[PDB]
């Protein structure tokens, strides 16, 4: 009876805290994932390429 | 009418931030194993 409103508050509050944890890590950690350079290429393809 | 499914999906999407644990490592659990081997195993 009153419990369902506390479950709704819990779910909303937790969802906002999960979102804030993502907004932190998905920049502050994720900047540690750099670009990769292609230094050089060799290949063979049809038509004498 | 409740947020429960969105909250469960967003919990699963938070757990995929494991790069922050990989900074040293996250240990990996073996949950279950199936096998066939010689000698009727």
CB of B7 closer than 8 Å to CB of A15: yes
**H-type helices in chain A, by residue range?**
3-28
A13 phi/psi in degrees, rounded to 5: -60, -50
C-beta neighbour count of A34 within 10 angstroms: 6
Question: In the structure encoding, which two tokens stand for residue B25, read together?
Answer: 């490592």
CA distance B23 to A5: 39
CA distance B38 to B41: 6
Angle at A44 between CA A42 and CA A45, to 5 degrees: 135
Cβ neighbours of A8 in B, within 8 Å? 2-3
Q: Resolution (in Å) of the shown entry?
A: 3.4
Chain B residues interacting with chain A (CB cutoff of 8 angstroms): 2-4, 6-7, 10-11, 13-14, 17, 19-20, 23
Side-chain-facing half-sphere of B33: CA atoms under 13 Å: 6
């Amino acid at each position: 009876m009153p419990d369902e409103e506390k479950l709704q508050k819990y779910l909303r509050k937790v969802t906002a805290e999960l979102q804030q944890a993502r907004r932190r890590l998905a920049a502050a950690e994720s900047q540690s994932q750099e670009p990769i350079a292609v230094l050089g290429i060799g290949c063979r393809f049809p038509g004498g390429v």
